[PDB]
Amino acid sequence: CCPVNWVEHERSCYWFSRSGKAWADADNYCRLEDAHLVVVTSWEEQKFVQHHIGPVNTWMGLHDQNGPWKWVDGTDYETGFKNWRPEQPDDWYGHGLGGGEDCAHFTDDGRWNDDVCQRPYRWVCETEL
Numbered sequence: 001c002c003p004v005n006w007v008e009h010e011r012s013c014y015w016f017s018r019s020g021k022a023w024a025d026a027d028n029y030c031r032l033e034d035a036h037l038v039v040v041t042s043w044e045e046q047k048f049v050q051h052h053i054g055p056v057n058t059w060m061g062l063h064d065q066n067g068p069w070k071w072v073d074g075t076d077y078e079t080g081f082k083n084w085r086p087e088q089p090d091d092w093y094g095h096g097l098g099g100g101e102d103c104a105h106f107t108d109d110g111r112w113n114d115d116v117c118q119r120p121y122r123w124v125c126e127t128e129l
């Protein structure tokens with residue numbers, strides 16, 4: 001029951017961009033497809049997403065723009081799956097672009113990093129069947 005060009009996996013439909021957008025734009029894009037930026041809640045889901053994105057920085061539906069870490073669909077961050085890269089998240093200001101780092105993305109090895117929301121990265125949308 002996924003739309004055409006979406007990939008079905010464990011009761012979810014995924015769409016993998018082949019272009020980049022700033023996090024807020026990627027967020028708006030997913031919402032307009034009645035979907036959200038991918039919410040990763042298991043090791044199995046992480047591996048599935050990694051397979052399709054490859055070694056490329058890719059936005060996910062996890063951010064801390066208004067304070068504590070939140071998943072875009074309300075999934076609790078504290079008791080949920082996490083796959084941060086060691087020493088991440090670090091809310092780095094050293095990039096000199098203003099602010100810390102408020103948006104999460106999969107890195108080239110799949111592990112997560114918090115980065116500057118304005119960066120154009122590829123993204124993944126997810127909808128639940």
Ligand SMILES: Nc1nc2c(ncn2[C@@H]2O[C@H](CO)[C@@H](O)[C@H]2O)c(=O)[nH]1
Nearest residue numbers: 088090091092094101107113114115
């Ligand atoms: N402290 C520090 N972290 C860095 C530096 N360059 C990159 N990073 C980190 O590496 C991430 C990119 O993979 C950034 O979001 C930061 O967390 C640097 O010069 N200093």
Ligand SMILES: [Ca+2]
Nearest residue numbers: 039040041126
């Ligand atoms: Ca999910």
Ligand SMILES: [Ca+2]
Nearest residue numbers: 091100101102
């Ligand atoms: Ca932050």
Ligand SMILES: [Ca+2]
Nearest residue numbers: 090101113114
């Ligand atoms: Ca970081």
Ligand SMILES: [Ca+2]
Nearest residue numbers: 118119120121
């Ligand atoms: Ca950039």
